[PDB]
Write a protein that binds this ligand. Structure first.
Ligand SMILES: C[n+]1cn([C@@H]2O[C@H](COP(=O)(O)OP(=O)(O)O)[C@@H](O)[C@H]2O)c2nc(N)[nH]c(=O)c21
Length: 187
């Protein structure tokens, strides 16, 4: 009689997120090809978007999805990414059907669930690149000199995906990727 079961129509997330899509439309430049699909700030709206969008393993080669916090564009040029970098995970051709979709959904849940605790503010978003040569998934962070935040993020993320502990993943600064002719950290 006292303890009435309570329920909620919406369950807000701690941050608002935006899903971006990149298509290699050869009539446009790189930046013009990076477009905002939609924003969400609740569990219900995340699942409504995820269940009704094309899987990463079904995208054409050269396409990308990105989930970034509201106000952060998924590019090195953004103020919140300029001094940052990314933890990069590389997949071979065999892993497209077996790992890509599982890894990306686990990455999305990692982000929206704030799995990095006190280093949550260092997280900017994640990107999945679908490529014929090999797929890639990355988590983008705001400051490549914050070693404690970067390595905590990397360690929690690598363990979450269930990656074998013997093969390392690297963290590349965006300033180094933008000038490539090199990893700052490994985990
Ligand atoms: C993420 N990123 C990708 N590029 C361009 O995309 C190219 C390839 O970057 P990629 O698509 O991340 O890797 P890929 O080698 O598997 O294709 C880079 O050499 C840049 O020309 C980018 N170009 C700009 N301006 N800004 C970015 O944030 C950015």
């Amino acid at each position: 009689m006292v303890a009435n079961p309570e329920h909620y129509i919406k369950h807000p997330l701690q941050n608002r997120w935006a899903l971006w899509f990149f298509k290699n439309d050869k009539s446009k430049t790189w930046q013009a090809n990076l477009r905002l699909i939609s924003k969400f700030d609740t569990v219900e709206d995340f699942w409504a978007l995820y269940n009704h969008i094309q899987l990463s393993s079904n995208l054409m080669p050269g396409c990308d999805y990105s989930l970034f916090k509201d106000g952060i564009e998924p590019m090195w040029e953004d103020e919140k990414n300029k001094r940052g970098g990314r933890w990069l995970i590389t997949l071979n051709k065999q892993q497209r059907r077996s790992d890509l979709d599982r890894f990306w959904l686990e990455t999305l849940l990692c982000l929206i669930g704030e799995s990095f605790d006190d280093y949550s503010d260092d997280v900017c978003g994640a990107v999945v690149n679908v490529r014929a040569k090999g797929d890639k998934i990355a988590i983008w962070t705001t400051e490549c000199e914050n070693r404690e935040a970067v390595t905590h993020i990397g360690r929690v993320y690598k363990e979450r995906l269930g990656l074998p502990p013997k093969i390392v993943i690297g963290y590349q600064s965006h300033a180094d990727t933008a000038t490539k002719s090199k990893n700052r950290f490994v985990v």
